[PDB]
Each structure stands twice: as C-alpha cells, then as structure tokens.
Design a protein around this ligand. Sequence first.
Ligand SMILES: CCCc1nnc(NC(=O)c2ccccn2)s1
Ligand SMILES: [Cl-]
Ligand SMILES: [Mg+2]
Ligand SMILES: [Mg+2]
Ligand SMILES: [Mg+2]
Ligand SMILES: [Mg+2]
Lengths: 194, 194
Amino acid sequence: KQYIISEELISEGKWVKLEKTTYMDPTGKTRTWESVKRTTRKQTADGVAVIPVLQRTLHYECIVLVKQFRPPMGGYCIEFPAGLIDDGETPEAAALRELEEETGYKGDIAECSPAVCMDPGLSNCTIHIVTVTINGDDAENARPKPKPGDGEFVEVISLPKNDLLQRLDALVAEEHLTVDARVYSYALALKHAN
Amino acid sequence: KQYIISEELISEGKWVKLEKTTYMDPTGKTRTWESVKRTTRKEQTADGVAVIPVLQRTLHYECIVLVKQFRPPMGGYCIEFPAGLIDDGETPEAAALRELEEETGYKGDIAECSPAVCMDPGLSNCTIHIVTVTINGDDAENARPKPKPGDGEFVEVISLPKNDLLQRLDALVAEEHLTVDARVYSYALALKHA
Ligand SMILES: CCCc1nnc(NC(=O)c2ccccn2)s1
Ligand SMILES: [Cl-]
Ligand SMILES: [Mg+2]
Ligand SMILES: [Mg+2]
Ligand SMILES: [Mg+2]
Ligand SMILES: [Mg+2]
C-alpha cells in the first residue's frame, strides 16, 4: 500500500548522502521525506554490532563494550564493538574480525540477527547483531591484543552482565559519556526479564 | 583528549543536515568526519523518545507493544518501539506517554526514563530517551483503544509476549519482509540471554 516512487540526490559526500524520497502514503497522496544513506553499502547490511559475552569461570559474565570519541556526537560514547562489513565478508566474519581489532578478544559465534535498522525515520542504515561468546579462560584471551586501524582509538570496558544497567547509568552520571541506544536497550531487558 | 574543532555546513534540508566535522585525534592530528544532524533539536535533552510499553493484564503474560509503519528512508515497513520527537518544552516522559497514546491508543504509566542515548553515533548526533512505561490492560481506558495518528501517520499495533519476543519477531521477519529495529532486537536478545 505505501511505496517509494523516486529518490532525488540532494548531497553526496565521501561517506554519506542526503536524499529526498518521494513516496505514496496510503491515502493515495504523494509525500516527501529527507533520508540519509551511507555511500559504502553493497552486503546484507551496512555493518555489524557484536554482543560479546566474556565468560570466565568463578567470575561474573561480562559484556565487553568500547568507548570512543564520536565526531558526530562531539563526545565520547560507549558502544558494542562494531564496524562496516567488508565487500565479500560474511556478517559472522565481520563480527569476529571487528571484535578482535577493537578489543583483542577472540570469540565464538552464538547467533546472528537478520538485518536490523539503526534509525529508520532518518536513514536506511542496517546492521546484523551478532552474539559472540569469549572464553576468557583460554590463553588467546589472556592478554588480548587489539589490532586497531589507522585513526581508530578505542578503550575497552567490560561490565558485568547481571548489573549492566546500573553500571551504565553510573558511567553516564559520573563520566558524561553517552551510552548507545542498543547497549541501553539490552541492559534494560536484562532487568526487565521476568 | 579528543574534541571538536569546527563544524561546517555542507547541505541543509528542512529536516536533516550534513556537516563536515573537524576534530582533534588523540595523537594531536586534525581529522574530518561527515556528520548528520536533525534541524529540529531545541533545548530538548535529546531529539526524541522511544517507549518500551509493557502491557500488563491479569492472567496474561506481559506483552511488549510495538508498532509497524512505512519508513521512507528504508523503502519498507519496520517494526519498532513507539517513538517520536520531543516537542519544544515538552518533557521526555510527557512525549513518551503522548506518542504511546497517539500511535497505539494505550494510556501508560511511567516506570523509568533513561538518560539521552545515541541512535547511530558514527553517523549522527541523534539521541533519544528510552522511556519504560507500564500499561494497565485491566483498566477500561485501555480496553479497546484507538490510535490518534497525526498528519500522514499510518501505524499498526503489534503486541508480542515478552516471554517469547525474539522468536515472535523472527517469525514475523520470516512470513513478512519487514525489518525489525535494532533496539527492539537488542531488547529481545537480552530477554533471551537472561
Ligand atoms: C529525518 C526526518 C525527515 C523528514 N522528512 N520529511 C518529513 N516530513 C514530516 O514530518 C511531515 C511533513 C508534512 C506532512 C506530514 N509529515 S520528516
Ligand atoms: Cl549468550
Ligand atoms: Mg568500530
Ligand atoms: Mg574498523
Ligand atoms: Mg513515531
Ligand atoms: Mg507519532
């Protein structure tokens, strides 16, 4: 019943473009929307985000997160490890790779989502969310070695799964970091579960 | 260490702008980013809200109330938490309750309100409050409720049991060609992981 009729390019950068979408609303009226797209997508999705469950015996399970400066935010943010899927990469493979580059941890795939939207009122951006467990007791994850690219500066922050929400709320109150909405949503459901 | 040096407008639509962001990396080098921003953000603590609406009813499993809408930037239908931008001077909590009633017909009760969290911080500055609201489904106010969609809003309400959310979302994606929101999916994953 609703559909896209055309897309007019407004402005194209190296990484991002702005478009004006014309679409048919369900009353049979023609309408417009300003839409953002990345210029990098081919793939299943633009990117992956990794939910990395650090499992170590006799310890609480941790969720491994990363803190970085985000120029669009003008501030530091706390996020799941994430990045863009290389052309010819699978989502699962991008997840292990990104997880290694950003944290040094080497992990195992548990499940992978279908492509899910990031901010669908604004952009077409999508990701796979890939749940990964990290055997924290193996020697490869003893002194994890982050292999970050040129210009990436990432701090690793592992927080306990069973108090995640309170821990994030603290980082926000006390560090003026911004927590990512997917990370916050995850933390909320850990509390809301039964 | 890192901070914004300058923000140079590239292209402004009525709703969205692209900016060339210049910032200082932690080595001391000047770098650039392409950044998206909304034009609508005021003194609001955030662009918007998303509502986690827990429908509670005697002798019923709790449900999460979701909405399905056409999203022009996506070219397709998306399943999301009820959500809208915060009006000038409106509180996040008022906005949440109001968007919830407008989009679903339900009258909720505030449970909790997050700090401002980032929607896609490598791309945009957009932020929301995630507002958890309970809905007393035994109250007559919430018996056979009508959405009051604004101008050009066409929303369908989908209520799924909290205890099976992830499988129910996976089934919808299997039978329907629709996209699930990344927040909704993250929340459904944590409900399983707990
Ligand atoms: C990032 C959001 C981009 C938008 N582009 N177009 C938008 N139109 C409206 O909100 C609207 C205007 C007139 C009648 C009905 N709805 S919002
Ligand atoms: Cl798990
Ligand atoms: Mg990354
Ligand atoms: Mg990378
Ligand atoms: Mg809305
Ligand atoms: Mg609305």
